[PDB]
Ligand binder design. Sequence first.
Ligand SMILES: Cn1nc(CNc2nnn[nH]2)c(=O)c2c(=O)[nH]c(N)nc21
Ligand SMILES: Cn1nc(CNc2nnn[nH]2)c(=O)c2c(=O)[nH]c(N)nc21
Lengths: 254, 265
Amino acid sequence: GSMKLFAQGTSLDLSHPHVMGILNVTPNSLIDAVKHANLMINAGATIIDVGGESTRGAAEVSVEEELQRVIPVVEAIAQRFEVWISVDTSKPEVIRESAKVGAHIINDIRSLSEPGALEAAAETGLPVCLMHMQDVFAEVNRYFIEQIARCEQAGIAKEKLLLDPGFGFGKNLSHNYSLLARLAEFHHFNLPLLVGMSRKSMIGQLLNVGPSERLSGSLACAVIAAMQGAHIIRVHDVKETVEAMRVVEATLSA
Amino acid sequence: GSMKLFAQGTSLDLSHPHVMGILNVTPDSFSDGGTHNSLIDAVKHANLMINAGATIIDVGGESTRPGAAEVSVEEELQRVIPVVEAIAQRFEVWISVDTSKPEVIRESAKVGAHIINDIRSLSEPGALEAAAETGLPVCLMHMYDDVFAEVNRYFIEQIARCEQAGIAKEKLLLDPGFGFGKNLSHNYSLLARLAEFHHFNLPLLVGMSRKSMIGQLLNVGPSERLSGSLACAVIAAMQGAHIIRVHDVKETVEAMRVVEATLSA
Ligand SMILES: Cn1nc(CNc2nnn[nH]2)c(=O)c2c(=O)[nH]c(N)nc21
Ligand SMILES: Cn1nc(CNc2nnn[nH]2)c(=O)c2c(=O)[nH]c(N)nc21
């Protein structure tokens, strides 16, 4: 409520939930990527998440490959749209170059653990998402305390930080649901909360359904998180999620 | 695991949410006594909903679409009773009946219905007495200076009305009546404050599926309301609503399982 992020001279208003559309650029191709961004923006996404290294035992990519895949897409979106852009990268060089071409958020699932990443993040002055990876609530909470301190000591202001409990990523079904159930408790940090549950195995394993059959469970997870005041919901299916968020917003507004 | 209803020799365990599938057997859906096999049609639909995980099937034979002509007692009996009977014979689900008529209430009970779900809360002549005589669970549905306070007060008065007629409190369900003389603001206030209705310690039943409170908010037509419906169902269920009345059972059941896994933790 009046919580805000600032980047690239603009601001993101976190008094309501935002839907972050996933834009996978691990598979002309530039134009495809931009058209996909266009669909997600038209569906109501207010942040577009660009990732160029796959996270499925998928192949690692070099610095050079990630630069070649990610940077042109970030740049083309900054030139076409007034939308926030997040980049999924662990690599110092990608962090620095993303900021130069107009990215708003560094979204590192490794929370800046690669050598030089922390320094690169601090130098950009960008918002940074910290994700917990592989009492679960106490473990994740402790992890947040440690990463905030780690970032503060590197010169990164607390107001630049976003927190993500890391659904999936070395977590069993019980552990995923405990985190979901207690998500609101993470507000004690007074930081933005970002969650990614879309199509995850915490739904697949619960319902015994494959990746393409997880829409309803995804929507349920998003609504549960948003009703607990999560700020950013990272999803594959933007339109459906945005419609769900409008129902949440009408409820919370009342 | 705690709160329960009893009817027809079985019990409904309300320690977790139940999905109630809508089965419309009114003139808007099917002929009665015509060439079409409406009975088999109705039962196949019930079967799909049960296979999708519905644990209650809501059967209604009188239309309540704005234009719709009222049906005779005989026609309503002919539409509803065969369907109630067929489900009570075949499937291990509860059956709710949507009727305001004393005769349909009495006959439904005889052939195996578990819940009387009257949107008129038994206000028709004879309905209250017929409901009491059956011994069945009864749903009370509301149909402003303050909408929450008006619905709350309505509940207090109808519970007392039912009690005075010999219906035990342990047979009662409460439904705030989404879309029932209610604009967008009113619908969302009731949804936001749903948990406050637990003070009565009674089952909460809600029906938002495909309603205008979604359609008008999102500017989507009746066949495109699934996401908004799911969101409503989840918001209600996270607030401990007991029964969710829906058209799209499979998706709702999936959503409830996510809720149950969350609440359990
Ligand atoms: C950038 N990113 N990517 C994924 C992709 N799914 C995955 N990757 N590795 N294993 N599964 C993701 O899930 C998330 C998440 O959950 N949170 C946050 N902040 N960023 C994520
Ligand atoms: C039996 N029934 N039927 C409807 C159909 N929708 C409607 N009827 N009239 N105007 N709109 C309904 O919405 C509900 C509801 O919401 N709750 C409960 N307990 N029973 C309902």
